[PDB]
């Protein structure tokens, strides 16, 4: 169980869909990361060298699922900027070379907060990190050094704040489905 997030994108004709199976944290989705090989990232490559020589060097890499917390992460700016659907706010669409498109829709939404590998690329980059988690105790979550990893009671998430996990799952899923914007998959 999880859900498709459809992101509108600036100057871009076609849209940004990503895959998750934890909404509960949308809020905290601070940037999108696209696979090398995506038709926006391409499209962004037509006035981007830096891209041109990163999508090169990946071609290459056949990178494995497996061997990916092992892999150096690796990924550069697209210059697009996508529109959080219930935020409204701007968010960046990366380029990385730990999203796939053989498996998934090829785009990401990363919450570096409360995922590792997102915590890893935002921090190498100086990318946003947007806690949204409270910590078991109801404190605070400390992301100095690494992500909260933990599922739990959601705060800095406006209308969702105070909710438990499985609520914000549903609450979160729901209003995206109700602003045609989302849809879940069983
Ligand atoms: C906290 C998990 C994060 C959001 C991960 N990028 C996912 O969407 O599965």
């Given amino acids: ?3 498709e997030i459809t992101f509108n994108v600036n100057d871009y004709d076609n849209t940004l869909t990503v895959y ?3 909404p ?3 809020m905290g989705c601070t940037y999108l990361a696209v696979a090398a090989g995506h038709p926006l990232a391409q499209k962004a490559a037509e006035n981007n060298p830096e891209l041109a020589a990163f999508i090169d060097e990946c071609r290459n890499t056949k990178v494995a ?3 990916m917390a ?3 992460k690796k990924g550069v700016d697209t ?3 996508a529109v959080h659907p219930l935020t409204g706010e701007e968010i960046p669409v990366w380029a990385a070379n730990f999203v796939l498109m053989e498996y998934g829709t090829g785009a990401v939404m990363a919450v570096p907060g409360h995922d590792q590998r997102d915590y890893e690329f935002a921090s190498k ?3 946003n990190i947007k806690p949204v988690i409270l ?3 109801g404190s605070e979550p400390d992301l100095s050094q690494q992500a909260l990893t933990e599922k739990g009671v959601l705060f800095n998430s406006g209308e969702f704040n105070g909710l438990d996990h499985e609520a914000a799952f549903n609450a979160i899923a729901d209003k995206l489905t109700a602003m045609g914007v989302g849809e879940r998959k069983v």
């Fill in 1 to 3: 169980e999880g859900v």
């Fill in 20 to 22: 998750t199976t934890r």
């Fill in 24 to 26: 509960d944290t949308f």
């Fill in 65 to 67: 699922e497996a061997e």
């Fill in 70 to 72: 092992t892999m150096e």
């Fill in 79 to 81: 210059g697009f900027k």
């Fill in 125 to 127: 980059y100086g990318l």
């Fill in 135 to 137: 910590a078991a105790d």
